[PDB]
Amino acid sequence: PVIPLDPARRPVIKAQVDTQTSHPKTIEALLDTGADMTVIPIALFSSNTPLKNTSVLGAGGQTQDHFKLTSLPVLIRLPFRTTPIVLTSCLVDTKNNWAIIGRDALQQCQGVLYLP
C-alpha cells in the first residue's frame, strides 16, 4: 500500500517476526528510511540465545552494548506480502525494545519513497 507521511502519526505496521529461537510473534514496527538496518526488541528472544556485540552511530551519540547483532537470519512477514523477508542479520535492542523496519527490509519488498 501507500503510506502517507505525517509528523503527528508515526508510520507503523504489524509485522510477524521469526527469530528462529522461539515461535514467531507479531510486533508493531516503525517504517524508517533513515535506518540502514532493522532493529527488533530483545523481548522476542529466549534469554539463552547468543548475540554478538556491535557499535552504532545514533541520535544521542555512540553507545556500548545498547544494540546487539543476531547470529541467525530473521524472517519477517508483512500482512500484504505472501513471502517472508529474510534478513541475514539485524540489530537487537536490549534496552528500549524498539521495533524499526529499515532499508535492508524495505529493499526486499521493493519499497520506495515517492515525492511527487
Added chain:
Amino acid sequence: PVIPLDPARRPVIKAQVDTQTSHPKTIEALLDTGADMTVIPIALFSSNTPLKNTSVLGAGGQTQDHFKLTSLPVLIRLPFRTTPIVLTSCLVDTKNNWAIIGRDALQQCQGVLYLP
C-alpha cells in the same frame, strides 16, 4: 521522483535551507520517515541567533542538549518544487552536524512511502 531504498545507499536529496538568520544554503539531507521533525546543522545559522532548549528521542539513549529548537520558521526548497516548505519549528544539531528531512517536511511535499 521515485527514490529506491537500499541499505547501502542513504536516500539523500539536495535542499536549499533558509534559516532566516543568514543567507540560504544548499545542503545534502537524509530523507527520513522515522523522523518526526526535521534536523538542521547549526552551521547554517548565525552565531548571534537565539535557539531554545529541549529533549529529543534518539538512539543510544536520550539527548538533553545535543539538539536545540529554532526560534524562527525554516523554509526549505527542493529541486523539483518552486514553492518553499515552511516549518514553524525544527531541531538544530549543535554537534554531529546532521541534515535530516523529517515527516513535517515530507507531509508538505505530499511525500509517501509505497510498499508493493
